[model samples]
Target chain A: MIQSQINRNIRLDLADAILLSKAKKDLSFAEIADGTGLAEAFVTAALLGQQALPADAARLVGAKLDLDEDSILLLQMIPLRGCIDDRIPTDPTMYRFYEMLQVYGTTLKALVHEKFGDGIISAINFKLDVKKVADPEGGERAVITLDGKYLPTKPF
Target chain B: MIQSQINRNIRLDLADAILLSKAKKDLSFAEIADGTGLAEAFVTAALLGQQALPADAARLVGAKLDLDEDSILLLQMIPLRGCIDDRIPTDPTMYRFYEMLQVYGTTLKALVHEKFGDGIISAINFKLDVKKVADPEGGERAVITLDGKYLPTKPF
Candidate 1:
Protein backbone atom coordinates (compact mmCIF):
# COMPACT_ATOMS: atom_id res chain seq x y z
CA MET A 1 0.00 0.00 0.00
CA ILE A 2 2.98 2.30 0.56
CA GLN A 3 3.50 3.82 -2.85
CA SER A 4 6.67 5.46 -4.07
CA GLN A 5 5.05 7.37 -6.91
CA ILE A 6 3.94 10.96 -6.68
CA ASN A 7 0.61 9.90 -8.17
CA ARG A 8 -1.34 6.65 -8.06
CA ASN A 9 -0.68 4.93 -11.36
CA ILE A 10 -0.98 1.40 -10.05
CA ARG A 11 -4.11 2.10 -8.09
CA LEU A 12 -5.61 3.95 -11.02
CA ASP A 13 -4.71 1.07 -13.29
CA LEU A 14 -6.40 -1.30 -10.89
CA ALA A 15 -9.47 0.89 -11.02
CA ASP A 16 -9.60 0.54 -14.78
CA ALA A 17 -9.23 -3.19 -14.48
CA ILE A 18 -12.05 -3.28 -11.99
CA LEU A 19 -14.22 -1.37 -14.41
CA LEU A 20 -13.46 -3.81 -17.17
CA SER A 21 -14.24 -6.70 -14.88
CA LYS A 22 -17.45 -5.09 -13.82
CA ALA A 23 -18.42 -4.67 -17.44
CA LYS A 24 -17.57 -8.28 -18.17
CA LYS A 25 -19.69 -9.40 -15.26
CA ASP A 26 -22.56 -7.26 -16.48
CA LEU A 27 -22.90 -5.62 -13.12
CA SER A 28 -24.70 -2.47 -12.19
CA PHE A 29 -23.07 0.10 -9.93
CA ALA A 30 -26.07 -0.14 -7.66
CA GLU A 31 -25.66 -3.88 -7.42
CA ILE A 32 -21.99 -3.48 -6.72
CA ALA A 33 -22.78 -0.98 -3.99
CA ASP A 34 -25.28 -3.21 -2.21
CA GLY A 35 -24.03 -4.02 1.32
CA THR A 36 -20.87 -1.97 0.97
CA GLY A 37 -22.39 0.46 3.43
CA LEU A 38 -21.54 3.47 1.29
CA ALA A 39 -23.15 5.67 -1.29
CA GLU A 40 -23.24 4.43 -4.87
CA ALA A 41 -21.61 7.63 -6.07
CA PHE A 42 -18.78 7.32 -3.60
CA VAL A 43 -18.21 3.68 -4.48
CA THR A 44 -18.38 4.41 -8.18
CA ALA A 45 -15.89 7.20 -7.79
CA ALA A 46 -13.55 4.90 -5.87
CA LEU A 47 -13.90 2.20 -8.50
CA LEU A 48 -13.20 4.78 -11.20
CA GLY A 49 -9.92 5.86 -9.64
CA GLN A 50 -11.22 9.00 -7.99
CA GLN A 51 -11.58 7.47 -4.54
CA ALA A 52 -10.32 4.57 -2.43
CA LEU A 53 -12.31 1.62 -1.12
CA PRO A 54 -12.24 0.37 2.42
CA ALA A 55 -11.07 -3.20 3.05
CA ASP A 56 -14.49 -4.76 3.56
CA ALA A 57 -15.92 -2.94 0.59
CA ALA A 58 -12.79 -3.57 -1.41
CA ARG A 59 -13.01 -7.26 -0.63
CA LEU A 60 -16.65 -7.32 -1.63
CA VAL A 61 -15.93 -5.60 -4.92
CA GLY A 62 -12.85 -7.72 -5.38
CA ALA A 63 -14.94 -10.82 -5.06
CA LYS A 64 -17.42 -9.52 -7.59
CA LEU A 65 -14.68 -8.49 -9.98
CA ASP A 66 -12.49 -11.53 -9.22
CA LEU A 67 -9.65 -9.15 -8.46
CA ASP A 68 -6.33 -10.38 -7.15
CA GLU A 69 -4.94 -9.52 -3.75
CA ASP A 70 -2.74 -6.82 -5.21
CA SER A 71 -5.67 -5.12 -6.84
CA ILE A 72 -7.76 -5.35 -3.71
CA LEU A 73 -4.91 -3.93 -1.70
CA LEU A 74 -4.61 -1.11 -4.16
CA LEU A 75 -8.28 -0.42 -3.74
CA GLN A 76 -7.79 0.18 -0.01
CA MET A 77 -5.45 3.13 -0.31
CA ILE A 78 -5.94 6.86 -0.22
CA PRO A 79 -6.30 8.43 -3.61
CA LEU A 80 -5.19 11.80 -4.90
CA ARG A 81 -8.67 13.29 -5.06
CA GLY A 82 -9.93 14.68 -8.39
CA CYS A 83 -11.22 12.43 -11.15
CA ILE A 84 -10.90 14.49 -14.30
CA ASP A 85 -9.14 11.94 -16.51
CA ASP A 86 -7.72 14.53 -18.89
CA ARG A 87 -7.45 17.55 -16.60
CA ILE A 88 -10.94 18.45 -17.82
CA PRO A 89 -13.72 15.91 -17.72
CA THR A 90 -15.08 14.80 -21.06
CA ASP A 91 -17.94 12.84 -19.62
CA PRO A 92 -21.22 14.67 -19.72
CA THR A 93 -22.37 13.54 -16.29
CA MET A 94 -19.22 14.62 -14.52
CA TYR A 95 -18.83 17.70 -16.68
CA ARG A 96 -22.16 18.99 -15.43
CA PHE A 97 -20.75 19.33 -11.91
CA TYR A 98 -17.73 21.21 -13.17
CA GLU A 99 -19.98 23.47 -15.21
CA MET A 100 -22.06 24.07 -12.13
CA LEU A 101 -18.92 25.14 -10.35
CA GLN A 102 -18.04 27.48 -13.20
CA VAL A 103 -21.43 29.14 -12.92
CA TYR A 104 -21.64 29.24 -9.16
CA GLY A 105 -18.11 29.17 -7.82
CA THR A 106 -17.95 32.93 -7.55
CA THR A 107 -21.46 33.20 -6.23
CA LEU A 108 -20.74 30.74 -3.47
CA LYS A 109 -17.56 32.54 -2.59
CA ALA A 110 -19.34 35.88 -2.48
CA LEU A 111 -22.16 34.62 -0.34
CA VAL A 112 -19.80 32.83 2.01
CA HIS A 113 -17.63 35.88 2.38
CA GLU A 114 -20.56 38.20 2.91
CA LYS A 115 -22.48 35.92 5.23
CA PHE A 116 -19.62 34.26 7.04
CA GLY A 117 -16.81 36.75 6.50
CA ASP A 118 -13.51 36.04 4.69
CA GLY A 119 -13.79 32.29 5.18
CA ILE A 120 -14.18 29.47 2.68
CA ILE A 121 -16.44 26.42 2.57
CA SER A 122 -14.80 23.29 3.84
CA ALA A 123 -14.81 20.70 1.12
CA ILE A 124 -13.54 18.56 3.92
CA ASN A 125 -15.99 18.07 6.74
CA PHE A 126 -18.70 18.24 4.12
CA LYS A 127 -21.62 16.08 3.10
CA LEU A 128 -22.99 15.50 -0.40
CA ASP A 129 -26.33 14.11 -1.47
CA VAL A 130 -28.02 13.91 -4.84
CA LYS A 131 -31.76 13.69 -5.04
CA LYS A 132 -33.63 13.17 -8.29
CA VAL A 133 -36.85 15.12 -8.27
CA ALA A 134 -39.52 15.50 -10.89
CA ASP A 135 -39.01 18.83 -12.55
CA PRO A 136 -42.17 20.93 -12.56
CA GLU A 137 -41.68 21.66 -16.22
CA GLY A 138 -40.56 18.19 -17.34
CA GLY A 139 -37.93 15.48 -16.97
CA GLU A 140 -35.99 14.93 -13.75
CA ARG A 141 -33.67 17.30 -11.99
CA ALA A 142 -30.71 16.09 -10.03
CA VAL A 143 -30.63 18.18 -6.91
CA ILE A 144 -27.13 17.93 -5.54
CA THR A 145 -26.75 19.41 -2.10
CA LEU A 146 -23.36 20.33 -0.81
CA ASP A 147 -23.77 20.57 2.93
CA GLY A 148 -20.66 21.63 4.74
CA LYS A 149 -19.83 23.05 8.15
CA TYR A 150 -18.56 26.64 8.10
CA LEU A 151 -14.94 27.27 8.93
CA PRO A 152 -13.94 30.86 9.59
CA THR A 153 -10.54 32.23 8.73
CA LYS A 154 -8.92 33.90 11.68
CA PRO A 155 -5.93 36.19 11.32
CA PHE A 156 -2.86 34.77 12.95
CA MET B 1 -16.81 -0.41 -3.73
CA ILE B 2 -20.37 0.76 -3.79
CA GLN B 3 -22.19 2.25 -0.81
CA SER B 4 -25.61 3.60 0.15
CA GLN B 5 -24.99 6.44 2.58
CA ILE B 6 -25.27 9.99 1.37
CA ASN B 7 -22.38 11.04 3.57
CA ARG B 8 -19.04 9.43 4.43
CA ASN B 9 -19.33 9.34 8.20
CA ILE B 10 -17.09 6.34 8.90
CA ARG B 11 -14.15 7.91 7.14
CA LEU B 12 -14.74 11.23 8.80
CA ASP B 13 -14.90 9.63 12.21
CA LEU B 14 -11.70 7.77 11.43
CA ALA B 15 -10.10 11.06 10.48
CA ASP B 16 -11.00 12.59 13.80
CA ALA B 17 -9.59 9.56 15.54
CA ILE B 18 -6.38 9.84 13.53
CA LEU B 19 -6.03 13.47 14.45
CA LEU B 20 -6.36 12.65 18.10
CA SER B 21 -3.85 9.84 17.74
CA LYS B 22 -1.42 12.12 15.96
CA ALA B 23 -1.74 14.76 18.65
CA LYS B 24 -1.34 12.21 21.41
CA LYS B 25 1.83 11.00 19.76
CA ASP B 26 2.97 14.59 19.28
CA LEU B 27 3.39 13.95 15.56
CA SER B 28 3.65 16.55 12.88
CA PHE B 29 2.01 16.29 9.50
CA ALA B 30 5.43 16.56 7.87
CA GLU B 31 6.72 13.58 9.76
CA ILE B 32 3.57 11.65 9.04
CA ALA B 33 4.04 12.35 5.33
CA ASP B 34 7.67 11.38 5.37
CA GLY B 35 8.49 8.21 3.40
CA THR B 36 4.91 8.06 2.22
CA GLY B 37 5.91 9.15 -1.31
CA LEU B 38 3.32 11.89 -1.09
CA ALA B 39 3.22 15.58 -0.46
CA GLU B 40 2.60 16.83 3.02
CA ALA B 41 -0.53 18.70 1.95
CA PHE B 42 -2.15 15.65 0.37
CA VAL B 43 -1.31 13.42 3.31
CA THR B 44 -2.51 16.07 5.70
CA ALA B 45 -5.79 16.38 3.88
CA ALA B 46 -6.24 12.63 3.90
CA LEU B 47 -5.58 12.53 7.62
CA LEU B 48 -8.09 15.33 8.04
CA GLY B 49 -10.73 13.16 6.27
CA GLN B 50 -10.83 15.08 3.03
CA GLN B 51 -8.95 12.40 1.06
CA ALA B 52 -8.19 8.65 1.12
CA LEU B 53 -4.81 6.98 1.48
CA PRO B 54 -3.29 4.13 -0.44
CA ALA B 55 -2.61 0.93 1.53
CA ASP B 56 1.12 1.36 1.97
CA ALA B 57 0.77 4.92 3.04
CA ALA B 58 -2.19 3.95 5.19
CA ARG B 59 -0.21 1.17 6.81
CA LEU B 60 2.72 3.47 7.42
CA VAL B 61 0.62 6.09 9.09
CA GLY B 62 -1.57 3.51 10.73
CA ALA B 63 1.46 1.86 12.23
CA LYS B 64 2.67 5.20 13.50
CA LEU B 65 -0.63 5.74 15.27
CA ASP B 66 -1.25 2.08 16.18
CA LEU B 67 -4.48 2.05 14.26
CA ASP B 68 -6.79 -0.93 14.01
CA GLU B 69 -7.81 -2.68 10.81
CA ASP B 70 -11.19 -1.02 10.72
CA SER B 71 -9.68 2.40 11.17
CA ILE B 72 -7.02 1.68 8.57
CA LEU B 73 -9.67 0.40 6.22
CA LEU B 74 -11.65 3.57 6.69
CA LEU B 75 -8.55 5.56 5.88
CA GLN B 76 -8.32 3.97 2.46
CA MET B 77 -11.84 4.59 1.31
CA ILE B 78 -12.46 7.30 -1.24
CA PRO B 79 -13.69 10.27 0.76
CA LEU B 80 -16.35 12.70 -0.33
CA ARG B 81 -14.03 15.40 -1.60
CA GLY B 82 -14.13 18.96 -0.16
CA CYS B 83 -11.94 19.93 2.78
CA ILE B 84 -13.42 22.94 4.47
CA ASP B 85 -14.08 21.76 8.01
CA ASP B 86 -17.38 23.54 8.57
CA ARG B 87 -18.50 25.55 5.54
CA ILE B 88 -15.39 27.77 5.74
CA PRO B 89 -11.91 26.74 6.83
CA THR B 90 -10.32 28.32 9.90
CA ASP B 91 -6.82 27.23 9.03
CA PRO B 92 -4.71 30.01 7.56
CA THR B 93 -2.76 27.66 5.29
CA MET B 94 -5.97 26.29 3.78
CA TYR B 95 -7.84 29.60 3.67
CA ARG B 96 -5.42 30.94 1.06
CA PHE B 97 -6.58 28.44 -1.55
CA TYR B 98 -10.21 29.36 -0.98
CA GLU B 99 -9.19 33.00 -1.18
CA MET B 100 -7.62 32.35 -4.57
CA LEU B 101 -10.91 30.92 -5.78
CA GLN B 102 -12.79 33.94 -4.50
CA VAL B 103 -10.47 36.41 -6.20
CA TYR B 104 -9.95 34.66 -9.52
CA GLY B 105 -12.92 32.34 -9.96
CA THR B 106 -14.73 34.72 -12.27
CA THR B 107 -11.59 35.54 -14.20
CA LEU B 108 -10.79 31.89 -14.66
CA LYS B 109 -14.31 31.11 -15.73
CA ALA B 110 -14.25 33.91 -18.31
CA LEU B 111 -10.91 32.87 -19.71
CA VAL B 112 -11.91 29.24 -19.81
CA HIS B 113 -15.14 30.12 -21.55
CA GLU B 114 -13.35 32.37 -24.00
CA LYS B 115 -10.56 29.97 -24.90
CA PHE B 116 -12.43 26.71 -24.79
CA GLY B 117 -15.91 27.79 -25.65
CA ASP B 118 -18.67 26.81 -23.20
CA GLY B 119 -16.73 24.55 -20.90
CA ILE B 120 -15.12 24.28 -17.50
CA ILE B 121 -11.79 23.63 -15.76
CA SER B 122 -11.90 20.30 -14.00
CA ALA B 123 -10.79 19.85 -10.42
CA ILE B 124 -10.91 16.19 -11.27
CA ASN B 125 -8.58 15.08 -14.07
CA PHE B 126 -6.58 17.87 -12.51
CA LYS B 127 -3.10 18.09 -11.04
CA LEU B 128 -2.57 20.33 -8.04
CA ASP B 129 0.97 21.17 -7.05
CA VAL B 130 2.44 23.63 -4.58
CA LYS B 131 5.93 25.07 -4.57
CA LYS B 132 7.74 27.46 -2.32
CA VAL B 133 10.34 29.85 -3.65
CA ALA B 134 12.26 32.78 -2.29
CA ASP B 135 10.54 36.11 -2.71
CA PRO B 136 12.60 38.98 -4.11
CA GLU B 137 11.75 41.24 -1.19
CA GLY B 138 11.83 38.79 1.67
CA GLY B 139 9.79 35.81 2.94
CA GLU B 140 8.89 32.77 0.89
CA ARG B 141 6.07 32.71 -1.61
CA ALA B 142 3.96 29.66 -2.30
CA VAL B 143 3.31 28.96 -5.96
CA ILE B 144 0.33 26.72 -6.22
CA THR B 145 -0.58 25.42 -9.64
CA LEU B 146 -4.01 24.14 -10.59
CA ASP B 147 -3.19 22.38 -13.81
CA GLY B 148 -6.38 21.10 -15.42
CA LYS B 149 -7.56 20.31 -18.90
CA TYR B 150 -10.35 22.25 -20.54
CA LEU B 151 -13.44 20.19 -21.20
CA PRO B 152 -15.57 21.69 -23.91
CA THR B 153 -19.32 21.59 -23.63
CA LYS B 154 -20.87 20.16 -26.75
CA PRO B 155 -24.56 20.64 -27.36
CA PHE B 156 -26.62 17.60 -28.19
Candidate 2:
Protein backbone atom coordinates (compact mmCIF):
# COMPACT_ATOMS: atom_id res chain seq x y z
CA MET A 1 0.00 0.00 0.00
CA ILE A 2 1.09 3.60 -0.52
CA GLN A 3 2.52 5.20 2.59
CA SER A 4 0.34 8.01 3.91
CA GLN A 5 3.51 9.79 4.97
CA ILE A 6 7.24 9.76 4.15
CA ASN A 7 8.36 9.70 7.76
CA ARG A 8 10.78 7.32 9.41
CA ASN A 9 13.87 6.64 7.36
CA ILE A 10 12.31 6.26 3.97
CA ARG A 11 14.47 9.06 2.58
CA LEU A 12 15.51 9.43 -1.10
CA ASP A 13 19.03 10.03 -2.56
CA LEU A 14 21.39 11.97 -4.93
CA ALA A 15 19.94 10.75 -8.21
CA ASP A 16 16.56 11.98 -7.06
CA ALA A 17 17.92 15.00 -5.13
CA ILE A 18 19.41 16.51 -8.27
CA LEU A 19 15.93 16.74 -9.70
CA LEU A 20 14.64 19.19 -7.09
CA SER A 21 17.84 21.21 -6.69
CA LYS A 22 16.97 22.05 -10.25
CA ALA A 23 13.34 22.87 -9.51
CA LYS A 24 11.97 26.03 -11.15
CA LYS A 25 15.10 26.00 -13.26
CA ASP A 26 15.15 23.97 -16.49
CA LEU A 27 11.45 22.93 -16.10
CA SER A 28 8.29 23.82 -14.22
CA PHE A 29 4.90 22.35 -13.49
CA ALA A 30 3.09 25.04 -15.49
CA GLU A 31 5.40 24.77 -18.47
CA ILE A 32 5.46 20.98 -18.43
CA ALA A 33 1.70 20.75 -17.99
CA ASP A 34 1.24 23.19 -20.84
CA GLY A 35 3.68 21.50 -23.19
CA THR A 36 3.53 17.81 -22.41
CA GLY A 37 -0.07 17.56 -21.08
CA LEU A 38 -1.72 17.43 -17.65
CA ALA A 39 -3.55 19.70 -15.31
CA GLU A 40 -1.29 22.46 -14.06
CA ALA A 41 -2.49 21.92 -10.50
CA PHE A 42 -2.06 18.19 -10.83
CA VAL A 43 1.42 18.56 -12.27
CA THR A 44 2.19 21.09 -9.57
CA ALA A 45 0.99 18.68 -6.92
CA ALA A 46 3.07 15.91 -8.40
CA LEU A 47 6.11 18.17 -8.33
CA LEU A 48 5.41 18.48 -4.62
CA GLY A 49 4.97 14.70 -4.46
CA GLN A 50 1.37 15.15 -3.43
CA GLN A 51 0.05 13.56 -6.64
CA ALA A 52 1.46 11.41 -9.38
CA LEU A 53 1.51 12.40 -13.03
CA PRO A 54 -0.04 10.24 -15.70
CA ALA A 55 2.10 8.08 -17.96
CA ASP A 56 1.95 10.60 -20.80
CA ALA A 57 3.34 13.31 -18.55
CA ALA A 58 5.86 10.93 -17.11
CA ARG A 59 8.04 10.93 -20.24
CA LEU A 60 8.49 14.66 -20.41
CA VAL A 61 8.69 14.83 -16.63
CA GLY A 62 11.00 11.90 -16.55
CA ALA A 63 13.25 13.64 -19.04
CA LYS A 64 12.89 17.03 -17.45
CA LEU A 65 13.06 15.61 -13.93
CA ASP A 66 16.09 13.60 -15.04
CA LEU A 67 14.67 10.34 -13.83
CA ASP A 68 16.07 7.06 -15.08
CA GLU A 69 14.16 3.80 -15.57
CA ASP A 70 13.98 2.85 -11.92
CA SER A 71 12.98 6.35 -10.93
CA ILE A 72 10.28 6.33 -13.55
CA LEU A 73 9.01 3.13 -12.05
CA LEU A 74 9.10 4.59 -8.57
CA LEU A 75 7.16 7.59 -9.83
CA GLN A 76 4.33 5.30 -10.88
CA MET A 77 3.92 4.37 -7.23
CA ILE A 78 0.67 4.92 -5.37
CA PRO A 79 1.20 7.19 -2.40
CA LEU A 80 -1.08 7.89 0.51
CA ARG A 81 -3.06 10.91 -0.65
CA GLY A 82 -3.14 14.15 1.31
CA CYS A 83 -5.30 17.28 1.34
CA ILE A 84 -2.45 19.79 0.87
CA ASP A 85 0.63 19.98 -1.34
CA ASP A 86 3.29 20.18 1.39
CA ARG A 87 6.41 20.93 -0.65
CA ILE A 88 5.30 24.26 -2.07
CA PRO A 89 3.63 25.61 1.06
CA THR A 90 6.60 25.08 3.37
CA ASP A 91 8.74 28.08 4.43
CA PRO A 92 11.45 27.34 1.86
CA THR A 93 13.34 28.15 5.04
CA MET A 94 13.14 24.47 5.93
CA TYR A 95 12.32 23.83 2.30
CA ARG A 96 8.69 24.84 2.82
CA PHE A 97 7.60 22.33 5.44
CA TYR A 98 6.26 24.96 7.82
CA GLU A 99 4.10 26.25 4.99
CA MET A 100 2.47 22.85 4.73
CA LEU A 101 1.47 22.96 8.37
CA GLN A 102 0.11 26.46 7.94
CA VAL A 103 -1.93 25.59 4.87
CA TYR A 104 -3.52 22.51 6.39
CA GLY A 105 -3.92 24.05 9.79
CA THR A 106 -5.63 27.12 8.44
CA THR A 107 -7.71 25.15 5.98
CA LEU A 108 -8.86 22.84 8.71
CA LYS A 109 -9.72 25.66 11.12
CA ALA A 110 -11.74 27.53 8.53
CA LEU A 111 -13.41 24.57 6.89
CA VAL A 112 -14.25 22.84 10.12
CA HIS A 113 -15.57 26.01 11.69
CA GLU A 114 -17.81 26.55 8.67
CA LYS A 115 -19.05 22.99 8.60
CA PHE A 116 -18.78 20.84 11.71
CA GLY A 117 -19.41 22.12 15.21
CA ASP A 118 -15.65 22.35 15.71
CA GLY A 119 -12.57 20.16 16.14
CA ILE A 120 -9.47 18.74 14.48
CA ILE A 121 -7.53 15.52 14.80
CA SER A 122 -3.92 15.56 15.90
CA ALA A 123 -1.19 13.84 13.89
CA ILE A 124 0.97 13.16 16.91
CA ASN A 125 1.26 9.53 17.88
CA PHE A 126 -0.82 9.01 14.80
CA LYS A 127 -1.84 5.43 14.14
CA LEU A 128 -2.00 4.39 10.52
CA ASP A 129 -2.92 1.16 8.78
CA VAL A 130 -3.21 0.32 5.09
CA LYS A 131 -5.14 -2.45 3.37
CA LYS A 132 -6.07 -3.44 -0.15
CA VAL A 133 -9.77 -3.67 -0.76
CA ALA A 134 -11.85 -4.91 -3.64
CA ASP A 135 -14.10 -2.29 -5.14
CA PRO A 136 -17.24 -2.96 -7.11
CA GLU A 137 -17.24 0.55 -8.48
CA GLY A 138 -14.05 -0.11 -10.42
CA GLY A 139 -10.51 -0.16 -9.05
CA GLU A 140 -9.54 -1.18 -5.54
CA ARG A 141 -9.49 1.28 -2.68
CA ALA A 142 -6.35 1.56 -0.65
CA VAL A 143 -8.03 1.39 2.73
CA ILE A 144 -6.08 3.54 5.16
CA THR A 145 -6.20 3.91 8.91
CA LEU A 146 -5.41 7.29 10.37
CA ASP A 147 -5.82 6.99 14.10
CA GLY A 148 -4.71 10.10 15.87
CA LYS A 149 -5.50 12.26 18.85
CA TYR A 150 -8.26 14.79 18.31
CA LEU A 151 -8.51 17.71 20.68
CA PRO A 152 -11.24 20.25 20.27
CA THR A 153 -11.28 23.64 21.94
CA LYS A 154 -14.32 25.68 22.81
CA PRO A 155 -14.88 28.65 20.51
CA PHE A 156 -14.92 30.83 23.58
CA MET B 1 20.37 15.80 4.18
CA ILE B 2 17.63 13.19 4.54
CA GLN B 3 14.55 13.18 6.73
CA SER B 4 14.09 9.65 8.00
CA GLN B 5 12.24 10.36 11.18
CA ILE B 6 9.28 11.97 9.56
CA ASN B 7 6.37 12.64 11.89
CA ARG B 8 4.24 14.56 9.48
CA ASN B 9 1.41 14.24 6.98
CA ILE B 10 2.68 13.48 3.45
CA ARG B 11 -0.10 13.81 0.93
CA LEU B 12 -0.52 11.82 -2.26
CA ASP B 13 -3.09 11.27 -5.01
CA LEU B 14 -4.52 8.50 -7.22
CA ALA B 15 -1.46 8.18 -9.44
CA ASP B 16 0.84 8.21 -6.44
CA ALA B 17 -1.32 5.58 -4.81
CA ILE B 18 -1.57 3.51 -7.98
CA LEU B 19 2.17 3.35 -8.54
CA LEU B 20 2.90 2.07 -5.05
CA SER B 21 0.06 -0.41 -5.30
CA LYS B 22 1.89 -1.79 -8.31
CA ALA B 23 5.37 -1.51 -6.82
CA LYS B 24 4.22 -3.42 -3.74
CA LYS B 25 4.03 -6.36 -6.11
CA ASP B 26 7.67 -7.48 -5.70
CA LEU B 27 10.54 -5.11 -6.13
CA SER B 28 13.59 -4.86 -3.93
CA PHE B 29 15.60 -1.79 -3.06
CA ALA B 30 18.75 -3.48 -4.35
CA GLU B 31 17.17 -4.03 -7.75
CA ILE B 32 15.88 -0.49 -8.04
CA ALA B 33 19.15 0.95 -6.78
CA ASP B 34 21.19 -1.09 -9.25
CA GLY B 35 19.04 0.11 -12.09
CA THR B 36 19.27 3.73 -10.99
CA GLY B 37 22.96 3.40 -10.09
CA LEU B 38 22.50 4.27 -6.43
CA ALA B 39 22.80 2.45 -3.15
CA GLU B 40 19.92 0.14 -2.36
CA ALA B 41 19.30 2.10 0.81
CA PHE B 42 19.32 5.35 -1.16
CA VAL B 43 16.85 3.97 -3.71
CA THR B 44 14.37 3.03 -1.01
CA ALA B 45 14.82 6.41 0.63
CA ALA B 46 14.22 8.24 -2.66
CA LEU B 47 10.98 6.30 -3.16
CA LEU B 48 9.83 7.83 0.11
CA GLY B 49 11.09 11.23 -1.11
CA GLN B 50 13.22 11.62 2.00
CA GLN B 51 16.31 12.54 -0.04
CA ALA B 52 17.11 13.19 -3.68
CA LEU B 53 18.82 11.40 -6.54
CA PRO B 54 21.40 12.43 -9.10
CA ALA B 55 20.07 13.45 -12.56
CA ASP B 56 21.09 10.37 -14.58
CA ALA B 57 19.94 8.05 -11.86
CA ALA B 58 16.64 9.88 -11.60
CA ARG B 59 15.99 9.10 -15.27
CA LEU B 60 16.68 5.42 -14.84
CA VAL B 61 14.71 5.38 -11.61
CA GLY B 62 11.75 7.12 -13.21
CA ALA B 63 11.21 4.06 -15.38
CA LYS B 64 11.69 1.46 -12.68
CA LEU B 65 9.92 3.46 -9.97
CA ASP B 66 7.26 4.70 -12.40
CA LEU B 67 7.87 8.29 -11.35
CA ASP B 68 6.33 11.23 -13.16
CA GLU B 69 8.25 14.47 -13.79
CA ASP B 70 6.95 16.22 -10.70
CA SER B 71 7.83 13.29 -8.51
CA ILE B 72 11.25 13.18 -10.11
CA LEU B 73 11.78 16.84 -9.33
CA LEU B 74 10.64 16.40 -5.76
CA LEU B 75 12.99 13.45 -5.48
CA GLN B 76 16.00 15.65 -6.03
CA MET B 77 15.12 18.12 -3.34
CA ILE B 78 17.81 18.59 -0.66
CA PRO B 79 15.57 17.66 2.20
CA LEU B 80 16.24 17.95 5.93
CA ARG B 81 18.46 14.92 6.12
CA GLY B 82 17.95 12.52 9.05
CA CYS B 83 17.14 8.83 9.49
CA ILE B 84 18.71 5.43 9.90
CA ASP B 85 17.62 2.54 7.67
CA ASP B 86 16.08 -0.39 9.43
CA ARG B 87 13.98 -2.87 7.44
CA ILE B 88 12.08 -3.62 10.66
CA PRO B 89 12.62 -2.75 14.30
CA THR B 90 10.12 -0.64 16.20
CA ASP B 91 6.51 -1.52 16.90
CA PRO B 92 5.17 -3.81 14.20
CA THR B 93 3.18 -0.79 13.08
CA MET B 94 6.22 1.51 13.09
CA TYR B 95 8.93 -1.05 12.75
CA ARG B 96 10.22 0.63 9.62
CA PHE B 97 10.48 3.98 11.34
CA TYR B 98 11.91 2.46 14.47
CA GLU B 99 14.63 0.97 12.35
CA MET B 100 15.63 4.37 11.14
CA LEU B 101 15.30 5.86 14.57
CA GLN B 102 17.34 3.08 16.04
CA VAL B 103 20.12 3.16 13.48
CA TYR B 104 20.14 6.88 13.08
CA GLY B 105 19.45 7.37 16.73
CA THR B 106 22.34 5.11 17.59
CA THR B 107 24.74 6.85 15.27
CA LEU B 108 23.63 10.23 16.53
CA LYS B 109 23.83 8.95 20.06
CA ALA B 110 27.38 7.78 19.50
CA LEU B 111 28.60 11.01 17.97
CA VAL B 112 26.96 13.16 20.58
CA HIS B 113 27.74 10.73 23.34
CA GLU B 114 31.44 10.98 22.59
CA LYS B 115 31.36 14.75 22.41
CA PHE B 116 29.06 15.54 25.32
CA GLY B 117 27.53 12.73 27.31
CA ASP B 118 24.12 11.30 26.37
CA GLY B 119 21.47 13.64 24.96
CA ILE B 120 20.22 15.57 21.95
CA ILE B 121 20.32 19.32 21.48
CA SER B 122 16.82 19.51 20.08
CA ALA B 123 15.78 18.05 16.76
CA ILE B 124 12.37 19.58 16.60
CA ASN B 125 11.72 23.16 17.71
CA PHE B 126 15.27 22.94 16.44
CA LYS B 127 16.80 24.40 13.31
CA LEU B 128 18.93 22.97 10.51
CA ASP B 129 21.43 24.68 8.25
CA VAL B 130 23.58 23.23 5.48
CA LYS B 131 26.56 24.61 3.59
CA LYS B 132 28.92 22.95 1.13
CA VAL B 133 32.42 23.91 2.22
CA ALA B 134 35.55 23.11 0.26
CA ASP B 135 37.69 20.86 2.45
CA PRO B 136 41.20 21.53 1.13
CA GLU B 137 41.33 17.80 1.78
CA GLY B 138 40.30 17.11 -1.80
CA GLY B 139 36.60 16.90 -0.94
CA GLU B 140 33.80 19.13 0.18
CA ARG B 141 31.85 18.77 3.40
CA ALA B 142 28.12 19.28 3.65
CA VAL B 143 28.15 21.00 7.00
CA ILE B 144 24.76 20.80 8.70
CA THR B 145 23.13 22.29 11.76
CA LEU B 146 21.14 20.06 14.09
CA ASP B 147 19.67 22.54 16.49
CA GLY B 148 17.80 19.70 18.15
CA LYS B 149 16.13 19.83 21.57
CA TYR B 150 18.58 18.96 24.25
CA LEU B 151 17.31 16.47 26.77
CA PRO B 152 19.20 14.09 28.99
CA THR B 153 17.73 10.65 29.47
CA LYS B 154 17.79 9.17 32.98
CA PRO B 155 21.22 7.69 33.33
CA PHE B 156 21.18 4.01 33.97
Report chain A TM-scores, every model: 0.85, 0.43
Looking at model 2 chain B, report the run of 10 residues with the lowest lDDT sum. Answer: B3-12
RMSD of every prediction:
17.3, 17.8
Question: Could you give candidate 2's per-residue lDDT for residues B23-96 as a string of tens digits?
Answer: 77576656767856565655565565444577787677667767677655555555534332232444564575
Candidate 1: which stretches are off by over 4 Å? A1-5, B1-156
| Model 1 chain B lowest lDDT segment of ten | B1-10
Give DockQ for candidates 1 onward, in order. 0.03, 0.02
TM-score of every candidate: 0.50, 0.31
Highest DockQ among the candidates is held by which one?
A: 1
Residue lDDT tens for model 1, B46-117: 876777788899999899888998877777877776544355443344556787789778998898888889
Q: After superposition, how far is residue A13 of candidate 2 from its true place, in Å?
A: 26
For model 1, give the interface RMSD.
12.4
Query: What digit string (tens of lDDT, one per residue) describes model 2 on residues A11-30?
Result: 23322243344454655445
